[PDB]
Amino acid sequence: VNSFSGYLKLTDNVYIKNADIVEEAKKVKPTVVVNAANVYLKHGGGVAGALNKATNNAMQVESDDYIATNGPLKVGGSCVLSGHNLAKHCLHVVGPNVNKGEDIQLLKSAYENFNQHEVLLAPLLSAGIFGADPIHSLRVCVDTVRTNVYLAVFDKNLYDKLVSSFL
Ligand SMILES: OC[C@@H](Nc1ncnc2[nH]ccc12)[C@H]1CCOC1
């Protein structure tokens, strides 16, 4: 039993809800919130900009130190940093950004990072401003993640389309 509320159960381990991931994280304070990161951990827009804003830019300050020490992430890769006021930890995961010409096959590699954590609150990787098809992102999530994932979909119209088209 965990404190996630109002989710539709898609499979044994995947759950989905129309929700603002920022507001969800503040309410649940999960062990792990997933950020839709880029390799530079520059949290400007989309989920990343919203999460970073909610931390009063502390996420960005921490991230800049991480990059100065370690260099950029790989597309498909991840790092664990603080969750600040939103969660215990933030798993920054880089899905491919189609608007940059990155290989969509890397989406599966990106979701594999979730398997290192027993329970996560997450967005759909590569969706929104990363330009991939969200129906595809959900399919890859369900077929790749084996740990318990609670997906927040910000857009209600998209949420309804995601549920009604789910196989
Ligand atoms: O990963 C892309 C998604 N973006 C977010 N998801 C959840 N919470 C969010 N807050 C701000 C942006 C954001 C798209 C895909 C479906 O719905 C929005």
Ligand SMILES: [Cl-]
């Ligand atoms: Cl987005």
